[PDB]
Design a protein around this ligand. Sequence first.
Ligand code: HEM
Ligand SMILES: [Ca+2]
Ligand SMILES: [Ca+2]
Ligand SMILES: [Zn+2]
Ligand SMILES: [Zn+2]
Length: 331
Amino acid sequence: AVTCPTGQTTANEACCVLFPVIDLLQEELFDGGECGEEAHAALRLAFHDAIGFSKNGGKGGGADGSILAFHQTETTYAANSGIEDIITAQLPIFQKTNLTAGDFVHLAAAIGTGNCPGSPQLAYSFGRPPPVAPAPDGTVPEPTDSVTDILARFSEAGFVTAEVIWLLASHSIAAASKIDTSAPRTPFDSTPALFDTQFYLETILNGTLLPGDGGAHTGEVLSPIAGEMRLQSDFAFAQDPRTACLWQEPINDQAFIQGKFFAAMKKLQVLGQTGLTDCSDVIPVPASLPGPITFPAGFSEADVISACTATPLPSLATIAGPKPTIPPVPL
Ligand code: HEM
Ligand SMILES: [Ca+2]
Ligand SMILES: [Ca+2]
Ligand SMILES: [Zn+2]
Ligand SMILES: [Zn+2]
């Protein structure tokens, strides 16, 4: 019900100002629409930003962009290690806009995630007011935290157990650079450029290795594949009685995870916010997956630990060379 300077059509004139910002992001941040490090980092940033929130107060203003506006404070916390890199890349591009910090952070994550084939078209609201103060320390879960502690933290923000697992489909387009300091950008699945369910499957393969210097760095546990990092907390969720059957649910069920991730993200990116305008039609529709998921080369069902023997895991093909090595996400 309107048409904007740059041409495109929308439901509200307020949404018209988002189209130049989306070009600035794709050019100057996402290396021309890639599902690379900066796309992944933008998603991570949105979570770290939004989880500075508690329904009972005292833990920050939520999805307010506090992590951008007050980064000198928040990027000094341990649990935010590596965030400073994202902030440094986002801050100059932010300044070429008149958005609030919250509206920028969460649009960058909506756009970046969509550069990943297989991801759901994410909702995007805007009109967030400026963040007031930095979140306090300790709002961001750490991979050594217990399952109990992590689910408790999420509850405070307003999320149930299942939603925590669906939110972790993010790790399908994700890597670690602060655990293995000599091995930056080590992915958590085989296909960090694709938002598929590979992640869920490769985390239940038997852990036999350690990547990089082959040593036990603190937040990681044994990985099934060379070049792949497995977080201690991801493996905890994958094996824990409370969550192991939820963990297997998405495998090769792309539509299942698309809806669950779309809905949990819709809530996450508005935590602590009220009174926003819907602008989801500015958000590009991400490409689809070129085909269903397959076992990595040299793996089969033989290699899985089923903590959910209540459900037959779905059959799937298995590319055949030798067991591969996954390179780091590019820079
Ligand atoms: C549930 C508890 C979670 C824990 C313990 C956790 C932990 C971690 C850790 C340790 C890293 C690697 C940091 C580094 O060393 O570079 C990471 C990366 C990442 N996290 Fe999670 N995370 C959690 C939940 C989430 C959620 C809810 C989202 C978003 C929906 C998310 C999105 C990401 C992304 C995209 C990355 C990759 C960043 C990049 O490659 O640049 N995480 N996470
Ligand atoms: Ca925040
Ligand atoms: Ca993936
Ligand atoms: Zn900085
Ligand atoms: Zn390591």
